Design a binder for this molecule. Structure first.
Ligand code: HEM
Ligand code: HEM
Ligand SMILES: Cc1cc(N)nc(CCc2cc(F)cc(CC[C@@H]3CCCN3)c2)c1
Ligand SMILES: Cc1cc(N)nc(CCc2cc(F)cc(CC[C@@H]3CCCN3)c2)c1
Ligand SMILES: Cc1cc(N)nc(CCc2cc(F)cc(CC[C@@H]3CCCN3)c2)c1
Ligand SMILES: C[C@H](O)[C@H](O)[C@H]1CNc2nc(N)[nH]c(=O)c2N1
Ligand SMILES: [Cl-]
Ligand SMILES: [Cl-]
Ligand SMILES: [Gd]
Ligand SMILES: [Zn+2]
Ligand SMILES: [Zn+2]
Ligand SMILES: [Zn+2]
Lengths: 404, 402
């Protein structure tokens, strides 16, 4: 039972939940690999023990462990697996499982919201055009004219033999990244590959640096087909600064909806390789990571030139002043456009309260410090001085190999 | 089966073969990672001694030679005879630099080869210890052109108590509990301040009172020694364009000198071996001045800057924090005291990572301590995966002597 200290307040807790951690991470007593983005690498008897565990904690979460339909649902699963080698989740179990996957996500700072999640059951989806319709409904519901609502859409689970449903885009909304003669990129460099793919599966490449990519959607076996997102469905936010008048002249924009669509949802031994989920942005994701990363839009120096900041010397902290103004612009622009966003101080304060809730409710909370501390102003937030334990609980979102 | 390490900014991939040589166990298991935690005879002595001797003889490209085997035989002989052994001067210099090179939480390790090593293993009393420390501070400060240095006092020995410096750093500001239950001065030094007072020190009543040294000779109570004021170089803090900032009366000291860690070299333990370098500006501006459990000045500075502190979405914290760091850098440059900003320091660390991959096949590094506490992702270390592990020679934490 690890002792976990908050070095700002002095408080001590013990993480007992970590003892229930099953699937083993990348660290050993000899070397810590906590900072690696992708840890390590990516007889139906194990399915039945994973399913029992999931059922047991589903009934625990509704008081009803002991007697009654808890007893009864264990046999239904045993019977289902003995007869088919797999099983189906009840709608309510699927809702509970998607929420727990979010709640168990060690890299997510927005987990105070884990109980409010809309779950669209697309498990009877049997087509790519059907997929596209589900995804458009999701986007419509989650975007909600800028009053963003958390949502996940669960497509059919992997069955032994026969193919997987699969969204090839890493998020539902991505900007195109176009190479050229210099090998430099116009648009988002993080999306060079998926842009390449979209073109080589039919797409007419577009203008410049904020072109919404089409969706490559893969029904089982039948190959991926392109789908174009209607522009009125993709809500975007032009970036302006409240006092720097020229900032809008940079022509910067970002989209309103963060919707991860390449991760695998796993519940009770079942696997859902296409289960896109969405929330709302924390402002540093846009301002600091997407716009200021050197391997992304990399605008820091452009904004610094315009601010007349002394770029001749690192000790002027011109990078830091320009970054703060870019986050100010992001926050200002989303608020003006009435699009839900959260600054990193509000987000981290919410995560500390979530850490307190989880301590009482489950005896701990898996958290990945490197991902929970924001990428600017880290020690200014109350999560910097909080020791955290990282471990893997089920249900879970997991990385998976790309569908090529 | 060596960890693959990626830099996400550039796409660099390497493998840390050096971690396979890790000489102790950390807190992590395959079940759970504890990487973020702040605090994670004769036959084992011999294998640590043998390993260190081997390292030393490789560094002087004399491995397996005659000198090498004589040393290995002289050490195990002397361990048999006395239960311990003595390092030669050159071995001590090599081991002290290696302990710096091996420190995973140090971003300043590009400098690890330029370390002045003072051999104080002949020290006899607390009064000699005090004289050695004052020459260390004088040499290291060098009128503001700071030089890295370590002073090594006698090793731990069976039959005698340890030399110990009770102060966690050689230069520290007193922290005084108050009527308000509050703290006047540095809240991090409340415990040491109360010890100084109860060993006779007549306290002050300011926010930047330099603490006396509590120096403990073997099998003695600690003895109190006052630092001559002309020995402790301080920097008054001003801002280049916020003129009211100088009126806050803020100061910091020139010399960061850690004095409470244990130096382990080839199984030998030096409980007293204070080392000093120079500050990176975020330690002063962000940690010491802005931490809420420290001088906690951030809101007052923001209020003086006429920032909207009613809501966090104005980013008043980030803005005030940046200008406080600007004032630290400008003030130290004005006072002609060595200081490095976190952009320059993280960039030189990347060059250290590269030097070390070539020389040793890796570099132990603690990401959460290498990434600066502001602007982390604006620095090149943010996107650099790192492998944390314990090599020896090492600087280790040790329990307080009281
Ligand atoms: C509602 C508001 C939400 C906020 C503010 C939020 C915030 C974040 C942030 C900031 C990160 C990564 C840290 C970074 O990139 O800087 C993250 C990662 C993650 N989030 Fe959340 N999130 C939200 C909703 C959700 C939802 C609805 C789910 C799942 C149903 C979710 C699951 C995850 C997962 C699995 C990760 C790790 C993703 C990866 O490793 O690529 N989040 N979240
Ligand atoms: C010369 C310039 C130096 C710089 C710029 C520097 C910088 C730093 C920084 C920034 C940290 C901790 C992270 C933080 O405070 O944000 C650190 C920790 C450390 N440094 Fe360096 N340092 C220097 C010299 C030295 C020297 C000369 C030694 C030893 C010979 C050393 C050994 C250590 C150790 C052992 C730690 C970890 C301390 C602990 O965990 O309590 N450093 N250093
Ligand atoms: C649902 C959601 C909301 C929100 N505000 N942020 C997120 C996280 C988005 C995100 C955050 C991030 F840092 C990186 C990515 C790309 C995929 C990562 C990179 C390597 C491993 N996988 C995506 C999700
Ligand atoms: C990078 C980082 C992560 C994290 N979880 N916590 C920190 C704060 C580290 C720290 C920084 C610091 F300056 C002091 C301490 C506490 C030391 C104690 C106090 C009395 C005796 N020893 C701790 C940094
Ligand atoms: C030699 C040196 C130079 C420099 N610029 N900075 C340092 C590190 C200073 C420092 C940095 C820091 F974050 C904390 C401390 C206090 C002692 C720590 C707290 C928990 C474990 N031990 C001290 C050393
Ligand atoms: C090397 C390092 O693990 C990698 O750059 C991680 C660090 N922490 C992060 N934290 C967040 N929130 N987002 C990120 O993309 C990353 N990248
Ligand atoms: Cl994103
Ligand atoms: Cl310090
Ligand atoms: Gd001014
Ligand atoms: Zn670890
Ligand atoms: Zn980044
Ligand atoms: Zn701090």
């Amino acid at each position: 039972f690890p002792r976990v200290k908050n070095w700002e307040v002095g408080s001590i807790t013990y993480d007992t939940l970590s003892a229930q951690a099953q699937q083993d991470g990348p660290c050993t007593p000899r070397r810590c690999l906590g900072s690696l983005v992708f840890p390590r690498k990516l007889a139906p008897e194990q399915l039945l023990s994973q399913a029992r565990d999931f059922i047991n904690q589903y009934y625990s979460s509704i008081k009803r462990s002991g007697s009654q339909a808890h007893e009864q649902r264990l046999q239904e699963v045993e019977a289902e697996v003995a007869a088919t080698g797999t099983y189906q989740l009840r709608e309510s179990e699927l809702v509970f499982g998607a929420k727990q996957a979010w709640r168990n996500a060690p890299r997510c700072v927005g987990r105070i919201q884990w109980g409010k999640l809309q779950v669209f059951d697309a498990r009877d989806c049997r087509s790519a055009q059907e997929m596209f319709t589900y995804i458009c409904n999701h986007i419509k519901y989650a975007t909600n004219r800028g009053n963003l609502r958390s949502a996940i859409t669960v497509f059919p689970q992997r069955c032994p033999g026969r193919g997987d449903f699969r969204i090839w885009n890493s998020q539902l909304v991505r900007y195109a990244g176009y190479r050229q003669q210099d090998g430099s990129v116009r648009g988002d460099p993080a999306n060079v590959e998926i842009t390449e793919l979209c073109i080589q599966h039919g797409w007419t490449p577009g203008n410049g640096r904020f072109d919404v990519l089409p969706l490559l959607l893969q029904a089982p076996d039948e190959p991926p087909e392109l789908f174009l997102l209607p522009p009125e469905l993709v809500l975007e936010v032009p970036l302006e600064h409240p006092t720097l008048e020229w900032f809008a002249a940079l022509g910067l924009r970002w989209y309103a909806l963060p919707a991860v669509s390449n991760m695998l949802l796993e519940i009770g031994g079942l696997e859902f390789p296409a289960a896109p989920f969405s929330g709302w942005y924390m402002s540093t994701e846009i301002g600091t990571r997407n716009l200021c990363d050197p391997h992304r839009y990399n605008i820091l120096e452009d904004v610094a030139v315009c601010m007349d900041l002394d770029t001749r010397t690192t000790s002027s902290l011109w990078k830091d002043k320009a970054a703060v103004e870019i986050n100010v612009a992001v926050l200002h622009s989303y608020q003006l456009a009435k699009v839900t966003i959260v600054d990193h101080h509000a987000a981290t304060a919410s995560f500390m309260k979530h850490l307190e809730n989880e301590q009482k409710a489950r005896g701990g909370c898996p958290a990945d410090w490197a991902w929970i501390v924001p990428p600017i102003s880290g020690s200014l937030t109350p999560v910097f001085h909080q020791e955290m334990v990282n471990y893997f609980l089920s249900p879970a979102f997991r990385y998976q190999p790309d569908p090529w």
